[model samples]
Target chain A: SGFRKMAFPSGKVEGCMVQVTCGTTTLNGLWLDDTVYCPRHVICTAEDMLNPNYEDLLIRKSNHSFLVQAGNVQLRVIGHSMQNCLLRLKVDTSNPKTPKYKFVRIQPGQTFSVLACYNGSPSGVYQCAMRPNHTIKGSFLNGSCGSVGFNIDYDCVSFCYMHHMELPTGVHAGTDLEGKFYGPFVDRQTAQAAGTDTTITLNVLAWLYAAVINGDRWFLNRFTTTLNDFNLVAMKYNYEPLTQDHVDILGPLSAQTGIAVLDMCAALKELLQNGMNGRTILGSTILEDEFTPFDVVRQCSG
Target chain B: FRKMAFPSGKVEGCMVQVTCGTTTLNGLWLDDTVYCPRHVICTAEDMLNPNYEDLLIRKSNHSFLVQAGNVQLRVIGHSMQNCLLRLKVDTSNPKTPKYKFVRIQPGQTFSVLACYNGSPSGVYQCAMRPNHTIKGSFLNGSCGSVGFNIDYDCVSFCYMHHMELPTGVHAGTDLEGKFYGPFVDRQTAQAAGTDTTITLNVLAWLYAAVINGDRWFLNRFTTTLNDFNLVAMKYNYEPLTQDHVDILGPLSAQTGIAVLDMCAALKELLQNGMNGRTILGSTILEDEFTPFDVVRQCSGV
Candidate 1:
């Protein structure tokens, strides 16, 4: 016979069987406290748990969930918990401005595949988790049931590579926001050939800007060291010295970013200087739209 | 007449006169003032802005009129004139390579430099003493010792190495000592008056060390390259090819000499094979040299 059908606030029970002798007589018996069974098996017979075939089912799900493949890219589930599973996906794009996203949906006893163009996303490190569709918030083998979380990335290599070789085409040249994201397959291939892990940790300008804003000195120092190495390596790659002409073209963009970051730093510094004794201070401005003026505030409540 | 021969001070936009024997061609004096089309408009503030263009402009004319017997001579300006005029003197002889003139101020001595376009040998006599005449000067005295010598040698090596590679091009044939000729002897190298052998030997060793994954070799070569690079910067000479350092530096950290070294080593070894016996200090690997033997040594001989 098949498994018992059960439904709870957690979610619908898709796969479970109802046994006749020495176990639950009906699907509803699984919920009743009076139901008794052998020590070896809770719902299924002891013979079922002991069977070698049961091990295959668990192994198949593990393999399918761990390495989710789509197109040429393969996303690895490096971490997992009762609530959600952590996935690492990469996408490559020719246009850095509009990066495309690859979605993966894993189901019980089914393989999840992603379908998306390789371009629009570059190479980078990301942190993502599954988001459940239903309000029940059911738990899976490792991840929750819904949309992924905000994955933060700092792509040092591709961004710098693009910056030096290609001239700025649009408004994005001044801001490296377009150059940040990357795809999985090509990066994995590079790692495999180099005999190294697929994790690229060089955060030259991207994370360096963030670290400066947050005033994280330790991260700033670490990123600086790596940036030096990257710079020297770039020189070895036949990258020409930044002539005055090159600086003239790139200086304004850098200055713009510098101004924005300095503004944030000033706000954060002022907030700290005022001493937050259980009260919050809103020092930074919030922009309503791209065309609208940035509104400012001096203080705020929780 | 003693023309206005000013000393070196406020270098930009200055002027000076040229003399042959006792005569000074008044109108034919050199103008140290730089006259590019865009220099005046392109200010420092605009240079820092990304929206502005920082195009390079040409220097003002530093030419001079001179009389060499029956031949009326015209010495045209060639390079930049920050402190003085850099003139190129050529007579009726079309075959004669032009001699470069770097006019030092009154305190500093004036001398003419010969262009090493075809690597011309021996003394080039330009008569400066005869009736309103300017005699040929020895400008190639320390030519090979400068960065130009090193640059020329590197070009030679690259050209020679390209022939060694197995490309489908006609240059695929192995042309070592025969095609490019053997490295010149010490005496011949000295005849041109620049100690280029040392630079050549250093470059060769660097080429070899970078190709081989010897950590010790790379460190020694790059350290030496950086040192010379500093010298190049001071003298306004183009630094050594930085591409080698960028590529090998990261490749070494990722994969030691196994894969990285093999790739570089093969190309180097092939090029070196055609070039004959390794010159003194050409090999970074010393006796009892191991992979981690960070200490580098060279032979006295």
Candidate 2:
């Protein structure tokens, strides 16, 4: 019931970006063009999610330009059988009132907005069961803004995952499934950060501090709480949590931080998966790894 | 590029509700929400395309940067000076409030790009910068201490009056033929007498008629002067006030823990010392954002 609207870029939409489900977890899909790539598990391996290119690559086949056709948001292998990855999620907004990229509970008496108290902050978390009488057994970090992991007893299979993403276009491509979804979209800055993809940028910490010195009241708690989640994960492995040391030197831009981002991202990715990818400059689909745009070197532009 | 300044009062904090004529824009994403705290603004989409003119607003408040029309604006600077900015308003509603567009001559503008551009390891200082430093008044708040702890030190500023910009109003111009200053405080200002200083800070002047007792000639003076901006300042009293801190409450900063009222704070400091008042970290050279921490501080640039 508590959903807030966030400002997004106003881009024209074509169709579905991806649709996948894992266990009880299900990631609906996102509506975007070739410029934006799928960083979740579908297009990337769990380890590959560590590569910056995992989110930077664009798709292109020698034959026809890939287009996400309109339909019920499903895979229709007839279009591109080579990569059996097909598309057919609703292209238009069927119900504009619902949050376009938020997750939901799929039980008989379902809840539309999925969130729980994680790391002391209200985060995107959902727990489901294999049996009506069985206790809801696992926690899923489905479409969370924080980096908490989706942990269930290795022996238990009651976990459920769902993720729904969209371009700035307000149109959504959702999926309904009985299994788990790929993984969470990038951990976003639901506080004072303004970047399109607020994931893994250590400099974002500085911006949060700047916002504080500038009279901001909420970003600190929000950032620290989310950072706390990441801390718990790294600490599980006896790793030092990512600190201002990674950010204080340079601001949050990739160019500013240079390879120093590797330490934080690598440590963060130790257990965590992929983050959301922002649209590349020039919209080239034949994406290259670590490709640098000629005109833009960093995202100092918000 | 258009360089305009959105005054404080009209634009609320980005965290609060912002409205046009009868419409209120939605809050930004949680992460981005805190960035644009008051109102919002952006240039027409065309402004960024082939028209690539920089739409930089100085004090547009902590408002949202709406890319609603496929437009992108880069918000620049630490205090947000010399940054890209825009205006968001429902002009259709005469009640929506009024904004303005002004042009700056090249001579009136300056760039800090060179400041960071020079150095030994390529990181250094700007040779020519504003000659002033932002000093603290009281560092006694828990973040520091009350009495024995380090007090927020105050810095001195020797005012400088360079050539006036074409957009700036003439100081000598009569405000409806009325002249007022050498202000003492609320009581004296009303009796047409004592006001501690030669001038009243904009906050005090805004409510002068009610608080200090004077005609609202300050309005005309305000409408005419274009060089106005807010700075985050500590209150020598409680939860420091604001750059716009003279007022506002998204939650933490209105006047938390403040011991005295505005009129009193201004009065107690200025009258007794007869030396100075609550000092704002004023001066040309202030610290710029990041990377140059060795020598540290980005004054001009």
Candidate 3:
């Protein structure tokens, strides 16, 4: 209830971006070719909650060349395959009001748009998953294709931990028990390069502050888990651990302060855990031995 | 409220300049003699254009003089004069109230025309003194004399000491001691056109934001700061008021007191200042959220 909508880069979704969500929170604006990883505990840590029959799913694995153009509330796909092959485009409106379709045909090296024949404006998030010919020239081949997703507005990026079975659901390769999810994925490397995006940091702090002040156990636990994930990232990145000075700076605030005192915790975790692995320009530190709920209050009050 | 009002040069004092809009409204032969008060009264004929023109006056350390046709005014150097010489000449409409007499003390620097009074057609003149320097120990100052005091203490080093008074509160430095105020009720405070409650509330909110990293609270703090500055501008008749750093000094020092307690005190003060009702109801807790939520809504930020 404390959350207020904030403006962001809102427009038609294009490029090799995929928006994925497991009910509670979503991870969007991700590079399709690259694996989008979420801390299991932070977002959705279980697969049972991520049902293929109900939960949202969209993926693009590329071997053949294809481009996606998204605008006019319609998504266009152009095939430039060297050889004739089958192509499949899947649209998940995820809304009962909008039509969902699967277009399967042979690639004529032509352009085609999806959702053009829809009766009305799509209400829910519009995501498209394309498969460009499962096999090429008699042998099974992996062709390259990109997916784009559209929604009413850009989902605000938030940091919190939730348990889930698969990191990115409907993917055979990626699986996890529980993890932390920073809302709507922005290429981790891009986000990490920016180093502690203030808007995102402030939102996270606001979320944490609201939870702490309101005594919302659910959100507190979620943020705490996210913090834990960030601590691991800090250690992985070789950044300095929490010190007395850092604690002193937070002064007098309780657990909510913990959510901010550790900057870019989730970003570091996502970057390091997602094979963007290395020492960040803002190096990591020991994430352990600090930020205990009680400790933050006691130490910060001093 | 600790610092009531700063001293200004009275008519008995010196160094004065008067201007009407862009034109110099004073006589061409203005000198130190014009800053002094005199029994001599000039009407529309004697003073240039009986219709008063809005005028601004500035006072300096040295005596000065000014002449408006037959009307002569002068300011003399005098240490005993602690207040400013405020003269309001109303020449708006001859049919209604044509002339009015007012003796304004220093701290109360600015004035506004009543809605019915319309605009002044006759020239106005004021005698101002330089900013005052607080005498004796800064600790001797107290908000209690003005309205109430919050017992707060936080230790830190300081290079200088200064005190600021809210316009609503009556405070001034006297040879005997720094006299704080004659505490008054909210209606009187507002009727007097003072911002004691607003200043007090803003100070408390600033401390609240510092402790809790609430951006909403911080934003409100900035807005309140601007409002305080606006009030300062109106009070001192200056283009700008004191800077944020100067205003925040005593406020930050008071952070030693419990933040929640300070917030409660501010809330109570606001309630009292607004006719004594529960400003924040039972739903709000004394937590960070309450202060942030209650203040933003209450202050219309």
Clashes of each: 37, 56, 62
RMSD of 3: 26.4
Q: Considering summed lDDT, which 10 consecutive residues are worst modelled in model 3 chain A?
A: A135-144
What does DockQ come to for candidate 3? 0.01
When sorted by TM-score, best at the front, the candidate numbers are 2, 3, 1
Lowest lDDT 10-mer window, candidate 2 chain A?
Answer: A1-10
- The sequence of per-residue lDDT tens digits that candidate 2 reaches over residues B35-60 is 12111233223223322123223333
Superposition error at A271 for model 1 (Å): 75
Q: What does candidate 3's lDDT look like per residue over B1-301, in tens digits?
A: 0111111101101122333222222111112212111101222242342211211113232323333323334433322112112232222112121111233222222111000001111101111112321111111211111111111111111001112234211233221122223321111222213222233334444454444343222222222435434544443322223443343445445445433334334434333333322222211212112222223222321
**TM, every model:** 0.16, 0.20, 0.17
What is candidate 3's CA lDDT for residue B298? 26
Query: What does chain B score (TM) in every candidate?
Result: 0.22, 0.17, 0.22
TM-score of chain A of each: 0.19, 0.23, 0.19
Which of the numbered candidates is closest to the native, going by highest lDDT? 3
Q: What lDDT is obtained when candidate 1 is compared to the true structure?
A: 0.21
User: Once superposed on the true structure, which residue ranges of model 2 sit more than 4 Å away at CA?
Assistant: A1-7, A10-78, A82-204, A216-245, A252-302, B1-301
The candidate with the higher TM-score, 2 or 3, is 2
User: What tens-digit string does per-residue lDDT give for candidate 2 at A181-280?
Assistant: 2222232212221112112233233332222232332211211234556666655543335565554443343344332333433433432332213222
